[PDB]
Amino acid sequence: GKAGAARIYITRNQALKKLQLTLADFRRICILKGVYPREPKNKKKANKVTFYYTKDIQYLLHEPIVQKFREYKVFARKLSKALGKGELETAKRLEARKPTYSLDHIIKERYPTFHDALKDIDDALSMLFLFSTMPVTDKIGAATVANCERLCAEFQHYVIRSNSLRKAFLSIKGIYYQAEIFGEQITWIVPYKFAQSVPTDVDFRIMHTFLEFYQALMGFVNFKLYNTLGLRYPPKIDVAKSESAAGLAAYELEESNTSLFSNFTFFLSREVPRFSLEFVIRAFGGKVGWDPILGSGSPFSESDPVITHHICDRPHISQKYEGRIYIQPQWVYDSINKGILERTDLYACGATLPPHLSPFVK
Amino acid sequence: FKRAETFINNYRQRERERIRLNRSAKNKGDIFVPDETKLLFVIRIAGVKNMPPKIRKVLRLLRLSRINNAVFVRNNKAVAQMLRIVEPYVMYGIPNLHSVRELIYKRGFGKINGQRIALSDNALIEEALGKYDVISIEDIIHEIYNVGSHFKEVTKFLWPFTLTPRKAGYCGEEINELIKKQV
Amino acid sequence: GAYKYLEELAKKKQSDVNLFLSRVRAWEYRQMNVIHRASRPSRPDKARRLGYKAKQGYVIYRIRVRRGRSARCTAEERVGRYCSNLRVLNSYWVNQDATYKFFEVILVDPSHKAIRRDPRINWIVNPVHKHRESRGLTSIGKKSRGIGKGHRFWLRHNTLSLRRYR
Amino acid sequence: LKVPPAIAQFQKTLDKNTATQVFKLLNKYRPETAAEKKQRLVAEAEAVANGKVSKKPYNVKYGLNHVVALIEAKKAKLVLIASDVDPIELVVFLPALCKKMGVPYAIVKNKARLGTVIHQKTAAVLAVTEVREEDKNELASIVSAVDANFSAKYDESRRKWGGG
RNA sequence: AUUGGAUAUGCCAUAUAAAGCGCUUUCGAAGAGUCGAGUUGUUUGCAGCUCUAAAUGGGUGGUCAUCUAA
RNA sequence: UUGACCUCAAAUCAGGUAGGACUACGCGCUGAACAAUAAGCGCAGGAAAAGAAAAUAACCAUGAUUCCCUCAGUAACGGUGAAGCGGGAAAAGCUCAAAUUUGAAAUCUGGCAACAUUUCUUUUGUUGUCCGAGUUGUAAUUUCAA
């Protein structure tokens, strides 16, 4: 009763009571740090409900996350006090000096080596990519969304520069990219740019906490990768280019089949998802051009005849030129996944699209 | 319940608005008419009860029947005159190409069969705008940005944007910044 | 100032305003403990002139004693025992009824830095003032043992003083 | 129970409308905070440390000894007494002193509300002594309202033993 | 070796400050269940109980002198 | 409603402090017998207590307290038994409450961060910042001698 399997596991209420933290705070600490439920072999004996090891609860007792959470809550109450009393200056000044937190200790504890963080960054990359296109809402943070988009752009630029991308598959949910960094394999899913809507069914607080932890892990990984490759962390970003929807062109990679399409100048019109096509072409070492509608800062133009392949999903090309025969994104995706250039005639405009084989499927 | 001072305050605003419309119409029939922008974004800031009948009619014509409603319109003398009349309750600015694309991708919804339907798929846009040579969201965005012949038809098909939470009057390029805060 | 009005109102102890407050508060104090902490003195004029300052280190305690030795002397001693870490500064009468006499005792914390850094109450920190009320060194204690100047107020007469040359 | 008239008068406080209008004028004349005072003084300190005459300040008067001295000097135009002072005898003479000195006075609710005007937890009494020329009509209208809504009202009620 | 009060001297010094003396067509707050009265006990003082103040007032002395409690 | 204020509690929360012992001398309370008596109880310090006149005097006036000598075995009382003056030792005076800083709470504790300092790595402070205390009153100013 008082010993054995009963002491082996701690109930959710018992663990919260020992840590003296609320359910929301405990969930945030568990999500930020490394803690998962552990069902004992003898559930009846473990209860003398969710079960957690006492070692995790013992470690979480001295965790500074709970203390930081109280400081944020205590400061928030003081900020509310100033607003009610009518002294706006006190609240405005106290806003700047509000408490914050650091995840460096948690990241080191959860991932002692960069290899473990890289292997566990597949979920972080997928979360960052998904949140990079989601609309700004009250639950989400506009600065957090911008930071996630910047982190995703920096990761794409680093992957393109290092040519770490290996496979690219076009799925219904989005684009699945498989890359090998430091031996570890990282898989990310980039949702398509569509007019989606909030399901209003999942917990926003849990998702935001997971996204914040994912962003911190992605930022630390990007800084380590930039230092290893000599790139400047963070890379320089052009404000004018960012306002012009230049994509990765704004993020300058300033220094502080990897050539499947190297001898090719791909061009994309305003009818295909050039966000993923440009990244795939850049990761392959080739040159990717986009129409002015898709974005600014395009090195090439539509009238330029130097483009060997013109990517266009439209069924009609009134201004088709010579030497720039239309190709489909399926051929490019198949070529990237297989490492060998596909047949442009087979995937030409107005022709049947060949089936897309998933590179992850063996 | 409603306090007596509230009703007088509403009356004083009504008398304040009546004079302002009298200023703009008589002896001041000149509008700024900003140039270098064929398309502008107008968002209804707020409205009060017992609003002037002329302002409500202008809002109905401009589809601003509800607050925090964003609509893209073409720069014209008639539009500028209507904007000046409803300047206190409407904020105007110059939208950007990136902002327009982001708004269409985030809160871009059209009016299909009299109902506001989000443009999550290009099939609905192609069917609704088959005669307008519009088949995808990018084509509609490009036509709106370029202000083509079918832009008016596209604007009618597209439902007004809901940029729920600002200064009053012309905002210029700063209106595009508010779009980033809304989408 | 307002302490001129408060102190002249405290002379009319059976007036309409003072009698109603005496009977209302006497009931309230009886529901409380025998010795209970006072958030602020019930007589801010009388405490102020007896050495009380509204600052950290100054404590006011209320105590009721049965009517029927000096009543004020026992209030000082009982509160001093209750708060053994404080020094009894002074005390005064706040209220009474048919059974109880209510007193408020001013105590000073000799360990608080606001007391030890204040030269005007620095004297109470010295050990010679440990339990002043216990040795008859307070205002009522001094009055109790007839200490004063004048004709109105032993060992050197029961002894034979024999000098060297006598 | 039965209460004397001098304590019974504190149960008849100023009405919600007049009190709300009173605090609109009071909130224009709040004393500067400890932070705002430091900012103003350090700003003049730099003008002295490097190298270089004002008007009299305007604020609401607070403090029991301070306000009573202002009434006795007839310097106060409006005196607002808290209705819930913990020892009532602290302000039990103020309505009579204000009557003797011809000072328009009112008993307002929530001594905490009075303290909020002066950036304090608690104030027993507030007093407006002299305001800017812009607010002469606003203060004059308030004093006329206090005359009707507090002095003309009650009055006969304040001389009667309350309670029972 | 540890110290104290001075002396000499270098530096610093928030003095737009702070004091004593002098003069007045201006002012000058002073401690209450205490003083005191009756009465009951302890050893005049003190203590209880009942009552309970004043403002050139109050105390103690021989109209005057002296003092200024709580 | 949010939210301030007042409460009433809680915390193995932070920093503190009290107890017991000695008790020759010291200051209270209490107390019989053969007298503030022994005992009994309470509380200090290197001395304690007292102390800068609600004091004496009746003079040409004295001038906080304490101790010694004298007054004096006197007055007075009912054998008890002082005191004023006088002579010595030593000498030191002051602090508040009661005034509006009102042209500016000018005041203070604590946390934190630096910089010092030491009977001392053990001690004691300074400066800056934030929070709290405080207008139901913390500083400067005043204490009748003015």
**DSSP string covering A299-310:** SS-TT-TT-SEE
DSSP D127: E
Place of tokens 């974004």: B41
Which residues in chain C have Cβ-Cβ distances shorter than 8 Å to D2? 20
- HEC string of D69-107 equals HHHHCCCCCEEEEECCCCCHHHCCCHHHHHHHCCCCEEE
Q: Which of C97, C90, C99 is closest to C60 using CA atoms?
A: C90
Give the phi and the psi of residue C58 in degrees, each rounded to 5.
-105, 125
Put simply, the answer to whether A85 touches D119 (Cβ < 8 Å) is yes
Rounded CA-CA distance B170/B93 in Å is: 6
CA of C148 to C1' of F83 (A): 16
Distances from the Cα of A167 to the Cαs of A188, A273, A334, D39, in angstroms?
11, 17, 9, 61
Name the residue facing B181 among A142, A244, A245 (closest C-beta).
Answer: A142
Q: Are A47 and A11 in contact (CB under 8 A)?
A: yes
Domains in chain C (CATH in brackets) are 2-157 (3.40.1120.10)
* Bridge partners, B72 (sequence order): B41
Q: Are B119 and B113 in contact (CB under 8 A)?
A: no
Q: Are B181 and B102 in contact (CB under 8 A)?
A: no
Put simply, the answer to whether D4 touches C17 (Cβ < 8 Å) is yes
Place of tokens 């005064």: C92
Task: Give chain A's end-to-end CA distance (angstroms, integer).
Answer: 50
Q: Are B143 and B67 in contact (CB under 8 A)?
A: no
Put simply, the answer to whether B97 touches A135 (Cβ < 8 Å) is no
- By CB neighbour count within 10 A (0-12 exposed, 13-18 middle, 19+ buried), where does A309 fall? buried
Q: How far does CA A257 lie from the centroid of its chain? A: 25
What are the tokens at A90? 């006190």
What are the tokens at D54? 């004002």
* Bridge partners, B112 (sequence order): B115
Q: Are A50 and A43 in contact (CB under 8 A)?
A: no
Rounded CA-CA distance A349/A336 in Å is: 19
Q: Are A279 and A265 in contact (CB under 8 A)?
A: no
Rounded CA-CA distance C73/A51 in Å is: 64
Rounded CA-CA distance C53/C59 in Å is: 9
**DSSP string covering chain B:** ---HHHHHHHHHHHHHHHHHHHHHHSS--------S-SEEEEEE----TT--HHHHHHHHHTT--STTEEEEEE--HHHHHHHHHTTTTEEEE---HHHHHHHHHHH-EEEETTEEEE--SHHHHHHHTTTTT--SHHHHHHHHHHT-TTHHHHHHHBPPEE-----SEEEETHHHHHHHHH-
Rounded CA-CA distance B85/B71 in Å is: 17
What are the tokens at C20? 């109603």
List CB contacts of B32: < 8 A, sequence separation 6 or more.
B80, B84, B170
Rounded CA-CA distance A241/A257 in Å is: 31
- Length in residues, chain D: 164
Note which residues in 40-69 of chain D have CB less than 8 A from chain C.
64-65, 68-69
**DSSP string covering A106-119:** HHHHH-SSHHHHHH
Q: Are D122 and D90 in contact (CB under 8 A)?
A: no
Residue type, C87: R
- Parallel, antiparallel, or unpaired for β B69-74 and B39-44? antiparallel
Rounded CA-CA distance A268/A329 in Å is: 10
Distances from the Cα of A204 to the Cαs of A61, A140, A141, A219, in angstroms?
26, 8, 11, 22
Residue type, D52: K
Q: Are A309 and A321 in contact (CB under 8 A)?
A: no
Q: Which of A318, A349, A352, A355 is closest to A334 using CA atoms?
A: A355
Note which residues in 79-118 of chain B have CB less than 8 A from chain A.
96-98, 101, 104-109, 118
Q: Are A38 and A85 in contact (CB under 8 A)?
A: no
Which residues in chain D have Cβ-Cβ distances shorter than 8 Å to C44? 87, 90
List CB contacts of A15: < 8 A, sequence separation 6 or more.
A26, A52, A57
Rounded CA-CA distance C56/C66 in Å is: 31
Q: Which of A90, A92, A94 to mutate to test the interface with D (most CBs of D within 10 A)?
A: A90
DSSP H helices in chain D: 5-8, 16-26, 34-49, 64-72, 94-100, 111-117, 136-146
Give the phi and the psi of residue D21 in degrees, each rounded to 5.
-70, -30
Give the phi and the psi of residue C151 in degrees, each rounded to 5.
-70, -20
**DSSP string covering C113-139:** HHHHT-TTTGGGGSGGGTTTGGGT-SH
Distances from the Cα of B147 to the Cαs of B6, B34, B158, D147, in angstroms?
44, 16, 14, 67
Q: Which of A333, A302, A306 is closest to A318 using CA atoms?
A: A302
- Please, what is the Cα angle at A167 between A163 and A168, to 5 degrees? 105
List CB contacts of C49: < 8 A, sequence separation 6 or more.
C3, C7
Give the phi and the psi of residue D62 in degrees, each rounded to 5.
-140, 160
Q: Which of residues 21-60 of C touch strand E (CB under 7 A)?
A: 46, 49-50
Breaks in chain C (C to N over 2.5 Å), named by the residue before each, are 68, 153
Put simply, the answer to whether C17 touches D65 (Cβ < 8 Å) is no
Rounded CA-CA distance C30/A274 in Å is: 84
Q: Are D151 and D98 in contact (CB under 8 A)?
A: no
| B25-39 exposure pattern, b = at least 16 Cβ within 10 A, e = fewer | eeeeeebeeeeeeeb
**Cβ count within 10 A of residue A68:** 15
Give the phi and the psi of residue B127 in degrees, each rounded to 5.
-65, -40
Residue type, A87: E
State which nucleotides on strand E lie below 7 Å from a protein beta carbon.
16, 29, 31-34, 44-50, 52-54, 60-61, 70
Rounded CA-CA distance B67/B56 in Å is: 12
What are the tokens at D146? 């206090």
CA of C150 to C1' of F62 (A): 16
Neighbouring chains of B at 3+ CB pairs under 8 Å are A
Rounded CA-CA distance A259/A286 in Å is: 7
Is the CA virtual torsion A354, A355, A356, A362 positive or negative? negative
Method: cryo-EM
Rounded CA-CA distance D146/A249 in Å is: 70
Distances from the Cα of A221 to the Cαs of A114, A185, C2, C81, in angstroms?
7, 14, 70, 66
Residue type, A167: K
Min distance A89 CA to chain D CA atoms (Å): 9
Nearest CA in chain C to D161: C16
- Parallel, antiparallel, or unpaired for β A309-311 and A265-268? parallel
Min distance C42 CA to chain D CA atoms (Å): 6
Closest nucleotide relative to residue C36's CA, C1' based: F8
Rounded CA-CA distance A87/D117 in Å is: 10
- CB half-sphere exposure, A52, CA atoms < 13 A: 22
Q: Which of A301, A297, A242, A244 is closest to A268 using CA atoms?
A: A301
Largest CA distance in chain C: 74
List CB contacts of B122: < 8 A, sequence separation 6 or more.
B135, B136, B137
DSSP, collapsed to helix, strand or coil, labels residue A254 as coil
Rounded CA-CA distance A297/A246 in Å is: 6
- CB half-sphere exposure, B114, CA atoms < 13 A: 0
Helix (H) or strand (E) holding C7: helix C3-9
**Cβ count within 10 A of residue D28:** 16
List CB contacts of A87: < 8 A, sequence separation 6 or more.
D33, D119
Nearest CA in chain D to A85: D116
List CB contacts of C124: < 8 A, sequence separation 6 or more.
C87, C89, C108, C110, C115
Min distance A80 CA to chain D CA atoms (Å): 15
**DSSP string covering A86-137:** T-HHHHHHHHHT------HHHHHHH-SSHHHHHHTHHHHHHHHHHHHSSPP-
List CB contacts of B29: < 8 A, sequence separation 6 or more.
B81
Q: Are A238 and A208 in contact (CB under 8 A)?
A: no
What are the tokens at A74? 């205590």
Is the CA virtual torsion C70, C72, C75, C80 positive or negative? negative
Q: Are D3 and D162 in contact (CB under 8 A)?
A: yes
Breaks in chain B (C to N over 2.5 Å), named by the residue before each, are 165
What are the tokens at B146? 């370029």
List CB contacts of D35: < 8 A, sequence separation 6 or more.
A89, A90, A93
Q: Which of A145, A153, A155, A150 is closest to A118 using CA atoms?
A: A155
DSSP H helices in chain A: 5-8, 12-19, 23-32, 43-46, 54-61, 64-85, 88-96, 104-110, 114-119, 121-132, 142-162, 204-229, 239-243, 274-283, 329-338
Distances from the Cα of A22 to the Cαs of A25, A69, A357, D17, in angstroms?
5, 10, 48, 43
- Upstream peptide bond of A299 is cis (omega within 30 degrees of 0): no
What are the tokens at C13? 């102890």
- By CB neighbour count within 10 A (0-12 exposed, 13-18 middle, 19+ buried), where does C117 fall? exposed
Rounded CA-CA distance A136/B163 in Å is: 11
Q: Which of D102, D107, D114 is closest to D15 using CA atoms?
A: D107
DSSP A234: S
Task: Give chain D's end-to-end CA distance (angstroms, integer).
Answer: 5
Q: Are A131 and A188 in contact (CB under 8 A)?
A: no
Residue C147 beta carbon within 7 A of nucleic strand E? no
| C134-147 exposure pattern, b = at least 16 Cβ within 10 A, e = fewer | eeeebbbbeeeeee
Nearest CA in chain A to B143: A293
Rounded CA-CA distance C23/C21 in Å is: 5
- Please, what is the Cα angle at C26 between C23 and C27, to 5 degrees? 90
Q: Which of A131, A140, A193, A312 to mutate to test the interface with B (most CBs of B within 10 A)?
A: A193
Put simply, the answer to whether A85 touches D35 (Cβ < 8 Å) is no
Closest nucleotide relative to residue C74's CA, C1' based: F29
Q: Which of B168, B169, B164 is closest to B179 using CA atoms?
A: B164
Rounded CA-CA distance B69/C139 in Å is: 79
Largest CA distance in chain B: 57
Q: Which of B61, B40, B42, B59 is closest to B51 using CA atoms?
A: B59
Q: Are A173 and A194 in contact (CB under 8 A)?
A: no
- Length in residues, chain C: 166
What are the tokens at D155? 């009055």
Which residues in chain A have Cβ-Cβ distances shorter than 8 Å to B98? 243-245
- Please, what is the Cα angle at A102 between A120 and A145, to 5 degrees? 65
Put simply, the answer to whether C1 touches D68 (Cβ < 8 Å) is yes
Phi-psi region of A338 (alpha: psi -120 to 50; beta: other; left: phi over 0): alpha
**Cβ count within 10 A of residue B118:** 17
Whether chain C has a CB inside 8 Å of the CB on D90: the answer is: yes
Which residues in chain D have Cβ-Cβ distances shorter than 8 Å to C9? 89, 92-93
Residue type, C3: Y
Q: Which of C103, C36, C92, C98 is closest to C65 using CA atoms?
A: C103
Q: Which of B182, B7, B36 is closest to B100 using CA atoms?
A: B182
- By CB neighbour count within 10 A (0-12 exposed, 13-18 middle, 19+ buried), where does A44 fall? exposed
Whether chain A has a CB inside 8 Å of the CB on B12: the answer is: no
**Crossing angle (nearest 10°) for helices B53-61 and B77-85:** 140
Q: Which of C139, C120, C117, C138 is closest to C129 using CA atoms?
A: C138
Rounded CA-CA distance B66/B161 in Å is: 11
- By CB neighbour count within 10 A (0-12 exposed, 13-18 middle, 19+ buried), where does A16 fall? middle
Rounded CA-CA distance B127/B112 in Å is: 10
